Amino acid sequence: MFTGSIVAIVTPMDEKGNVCRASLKKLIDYHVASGTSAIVSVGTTGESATLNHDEHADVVMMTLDLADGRIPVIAGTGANATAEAISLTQRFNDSGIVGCLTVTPYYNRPSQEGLYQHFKAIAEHTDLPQILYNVPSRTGCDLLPETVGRLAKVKNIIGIREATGNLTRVNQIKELVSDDFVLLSGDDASALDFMQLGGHGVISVTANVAARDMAQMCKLAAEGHFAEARVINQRLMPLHNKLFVEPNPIPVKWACKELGLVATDTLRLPMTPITDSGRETVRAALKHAGLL
Amino acid sequence: MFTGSIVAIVTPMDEKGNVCRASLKKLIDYHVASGTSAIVSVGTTGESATLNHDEHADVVMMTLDLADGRIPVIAGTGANATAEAISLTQRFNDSGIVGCLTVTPYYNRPSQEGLYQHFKAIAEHTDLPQILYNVPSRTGCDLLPETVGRLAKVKNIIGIREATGNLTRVNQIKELVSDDFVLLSGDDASALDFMQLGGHGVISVTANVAARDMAQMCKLAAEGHFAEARVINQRLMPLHNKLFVEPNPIPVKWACKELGLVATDTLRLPMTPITDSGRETVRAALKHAGLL
Ligand SMILES: [K+]
Ligand SMILES: [K+]
Ligand SMILES: [K+]
Ligand SMILES: [K+]
């Protein structure tokens, strides 16, 4: 699945900062029961930044195993060095994951030509479907619609997760690619708008704690019932905003613990524990969404 | 040494992308002869992004070996996971490097508290001097003067390379830290302004190809001879700008190749070869500087 509500799943940890299997299983069961369409394993929200490649791969394989064919699993495979992106991608070749979510190189700020070569080379070393991931606020780099058009011509580059919050990109990209190229929002607060413009779903942080509502919202969207979808969206809007009151995934992990979905809200440095003021902010948004 | 002109040195490569010892030796002899204060080894301009930690450490050790006590060497040691930063730092214990240049975590966008905890932990676990490195355009986060002030109180956090190009930061930081805390520009085009406002030196990309002029400009600035320094700066200003006409270090490696300082201008993906228009823009900047 590359449609509907796709969760950017947290990597729940024990107090030592290592993956908590019991909490992972609980989350995956919750997504299966909630109608979540797919899981992105070890992306931004899953702390790809603070896991090494072995630990990253371990979490993905554990997620795939625990999913047990019940829900598709997409691996986060981003790296800012092309050779490393290829190497990470190869760990999942012939694994059971359905596709990869691959971010524009961060920090080194490649040109649009460099982005084209990075993703082309990655695609050439895999049989897995590739979803491009654009998030300039984290990367320092902006994959423009014209380059997306170029890359969409590569056989196994099948979609884009667009996290700019710039809604004009939907139709600029759609104009330049074929009808089957998947357009996914990477920005919860604008994701319903993104779908109203022609987007096919959302890779969502909110879905971590509001999976049923999120799944319902995207289904309504896909059927053209936007007024009905907006009612849910307004119920979820404080979460769409306040889950970033502190650096993601600090708030969403606390929210998961609060809802009893994970054993601990532990994260790896440089992410730090949620402040007291942060707890109260997220608690009120959970209450507004009617989740407590 | 942590004042004056400090070169953010390129990592010269053969056609296969592997470090070229003979080109590195030439660059190092050139900086020894040209009065450069120190070499930053495997930072941003050194393609830290696309070397693994083993190649990274190899290049630094080779740099120390070739320098042979003639010029101080500072290692780039930045990482977006604290544990990984600490691990990378350990590789350089008793190596002979004089200090480390450590970037704010990129991509994961930690809070000021997270940044504080990050750099505090790195400093705790080494005796090597640490220079903080702030470059929001690359990292997606901004180490603010208040937090720099908190970190300056750590015994072995000794300075900051400020690459915002925001010159108000010089005196906002200076007011908060003791008089021996080193303030270095990380932005060639505003570096002389930075030094006129109280800065102590520059970590420079332009110094790769204009080492002597850079060294003299920084000495004149340190002596208060700002008009004299600005004459040199005006002839280097096209280089300060045009070395970023395409993504750094693409133009500067081409320039080094053109001057005969390195054998090839090869980079690793996602960095791609300089375009022809780039060649001419950079060629013209070199001629304006008197280098061709
Ligand atoms: K990582
Ligand atoms: K395609
Ligand atoms: K690296
Ligand atoms: K200090």
Coordinates of C-alpha atoms and ligand atoms in Angstrom, one line a residue, chain B residues 151-159 178 180-181, ligand 4:
Chain B
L151 CA 28.5 25.7 26.8
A152 CA 31.4 28.1 27.1
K153 CA 31.5 27.3 30.8
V154 CA 32.6 23.8 29.9
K155 CA 36.4 23.7 30.4
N156 CA 37.3 22.2 27.0
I157 CA 34.6 23.9 24.8
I158 CA 36.9 26.6 23.6
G159 CA 35.2 28.5 20.8
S178 CA 34.9 34.9 28.7
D180 CA 39.5 33.9 25.8
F181 CA 36.6 32.1 24.1
Ligands
K4 K 35.5 26.9 28.0

